């Protein structure tokens, strides 16, 4: 058994699978630390270092992306990971852990649960 | 069909889907189908006594 979530952006859409495991992080068949724009690598390290790497050793996560640019894909990946962990610890783990994770993750940043509702406005005659 | 608002009505495209974002969404949850929508979400005069005038 496992949990599938989705992360959204302007045009970048990602899906995320979280299941039992030894703590493997995979994005597009690759680990999280070699996404091509290296400069936002701490963004890819924002969720896990917010929680602690020892806790993630029971969950294996795999994220696939399609659409958007580089940084939009990065934001979709990190938001999808955050919502994957909170959904996994809500459905499978007791409510107190989900509540404290949600509280710390909502006092850190707003976009890590609901993405920024921004899109390009169309041109009309 | 038998609802109140359906009777009182002023009387490709089908492949569109609508997600709703609350609790996080799990695709493998058996009750996720409640959170998806197949369609788009969302004159008379008054007298002194308060009675309407119909003509």
């Amino acid at each position: 058994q496992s949990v599938q979530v989705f992360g959204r952006k302007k045009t970048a859409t990602a899906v995320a699978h979280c299941k039992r495991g030894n703590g493997l992080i995979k994005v597009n068949g690759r680990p999280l630390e070699m996404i091509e724009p290296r400069t936002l690598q701490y963004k890819l390290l924002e969720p896990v270092l917010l929680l602690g790497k020892e806790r993630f050793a029971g969950v294996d996560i795999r994220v696939r992306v399609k659409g958007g640019g580089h940084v939009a894909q990065i934001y979709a990946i990190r938001q999808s990971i955050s919502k994957a962990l909170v959904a996994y610890y809500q459905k499978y783990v007791d409510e107190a852990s989900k509540k404290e994770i949600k509280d710390i993750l909502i006092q850190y940043d707003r976009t890590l649960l609901v993405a920024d509702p921004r899109r390009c406005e169309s041109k009309k005659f | 069909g038998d609802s109140i608002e359906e009777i009182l009505a002023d009387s490709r495209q089908r492949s569109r889907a609508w997600l709703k974002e609350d609790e996080p969404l799990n695709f493998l949850d058996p009750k996720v189908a409640q959170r998806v929508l197949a369609t788009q979400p969302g004159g008379f005069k008054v007298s002194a006594d308060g009675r309407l005038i119909i003509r």
Partner: peptide, 25 residues
Amino acid sequence: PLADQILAGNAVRAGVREKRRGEEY
């Protein structure tokens, strides 16, 4: 009154002006 006129001339008008500028699914 006289003092009201003097103080209105001594102050600057302010207050109301509505400037009209500028998810779930």
